[PDB]
From a paper:
S1 nuclease from Aspergillus oryzae (EC 3.1.30.1; NCBI sequence ID: XP_001818636; S1–P1 nuclease family in Pfam, PF02265) is an extracellular, single–strand–specific, sugar non–specific, Zn2+–dependent, fungal nuclease with 3'–mononucleotidase activity with a pH optimum in range 4.0–4.3. The active site is located in a surface cleft and composed of the obligatory catalytic trinuclear zinc cluster supplemented by Lys68 and the nucleoside binding site 1 (NBS1; also called Phe site in the previous studies). A cluster of three zinc ions coordinates the substrate/product scissile phosphate and the reaction mechanism utilizes water activated by Zn2+ ions as a nucleophile.
The mutant D65N has the same tertiary structure as the wild type. Products of 3’monunucleotidase activity are bound in the active site: phosphate with 2’–deoxycytidine or 2'–deoxyguanosine. A phosphate ion is bound inside the zinc cluster in the first binding mode in protein chain A. The second molecule of dCyt binds in the secondary binding site composed of Tyr183 providing a stacking interaction for the nucleobase and Glu177 providing hydrogen bonding. We refer to this site as “Half–Tyr site” with respect to the P1 nuclease Tyr site which is composed of two tyrosine residues. Chain B also contains a phosphate ion in the first binding mode. Simultaneously, one molecule of 2'–deoxyguanosine (dGua) is bound in the active site, interacting with NBS1 and the zinc cluster. In this binding mode deoxyribose is oriented out of the active site without any direct interaction with the protein.
Numbering used by the authors: 21 to 287
Amino acid sequence: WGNLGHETVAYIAQSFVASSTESFCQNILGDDSTSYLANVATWANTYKYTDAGEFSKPYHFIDAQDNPPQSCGVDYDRDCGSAGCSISAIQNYTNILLESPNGSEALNALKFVVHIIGDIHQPLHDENLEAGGNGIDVTYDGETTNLHHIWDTNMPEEAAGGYSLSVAKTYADLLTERIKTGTYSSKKDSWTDGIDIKDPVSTSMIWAADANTYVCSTVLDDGLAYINSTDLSGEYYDKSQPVFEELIAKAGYRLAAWLDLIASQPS
Ligand SMILES: Nc1ccn([C@H]2C[C@H](O)[C@@H](CO)O2)c(=O)n1
Ligand SMILES: Nc1ccn([C@H]2C[C@H](O)[C@@H](CO)O2)c(=O)n1
Ligand SMILES: *[C@@H]1O[C@H](CO)[C@@H](O)[C@H](O)[C@H]1NC(C)=O
Ligand SMILES: *[C@@H]1O[C@H](CO)[C@@H](O)[C@H](O)[C@H]1NC(C)=O
Ligand SMILES: [Zn+2]
Ligand SMILES: [Zn+2]
Ligand SMILES: [Zn+2]
């Protein structure tokens, strides 16, 4: 996701974590504002463009070698690669937070988890084709961009009605209400099925597989000729919106569940 998506995911998580989980995170982050998760939700992106953080670029995605839009699937051994991926990074950073929650590595590990649980839920972060759709040129409301970018940024910003942190907070609260009492309330019990703090690979693979199904159903089902030749702010947007909204909601809810687990380990 772009900044709006990541900040939305983070504000949703802040709405669902336990009070002790909140304190646990605020201490690690050295940020006790009411935007504590949202303030750091883009850090991993910032960091990957620095000298020290270049190595972490591959941690934002898993390049699933599947066959969309006819068939989708993610396979950890097949797809992660020797440079690491979203799934191997969730393992590494979760385990840092379990083994050394007070240590010097906990700050970055937490910021990585917050960002990467978000990124896993963006379907094109679970797809090899043309570098997660970066290589696919599109027109969006008259602007030339690419397919990955519209999923990350153009479409969520359009749906949220902006890009600022305060817009993110309002979008988060909309989606949060959908979870508590609205259209997602009968789905959310299934959203933490299979979650296991002792098996970050399996757990994050559930989420990656889930987002990946949308590559076939939604992202690419019109086919590449349609996508090359049509302005995607029309019908493509209209059918994309409910999918990215639900996936952002899931990302937030799952991030909160995972943070609760990490924060509750005895010591
Ligand atoms: N194989 C790839 C390559 C890049 N990206 C993401 C991370 C990059 O910062 C962004 C570029 O728009 O897309 C992706 O998800 N999959
Ligand atoms: N994430 C972003 C960043 C910028 N802009 C647009 C609106 C801003 O006014 C302009 C900045 O030059 O670009 C946008 O819509 N989304
Ligand atoms: C785990 O995280 C640390 C700190 O960013 C990094 O040095 C290391 O290479 C990572 N290990 C794996 C296996 O991803
Ligand atoms: C997109 O259009 C360009 C130029 O019209 C052409 O080179 C290319 O083959 C097209 N790609 C697809 C998948 O239609
Ligand atoms: Zn992102
Ligand atoms: Zn992206
Ligand atoms: Zn990222």
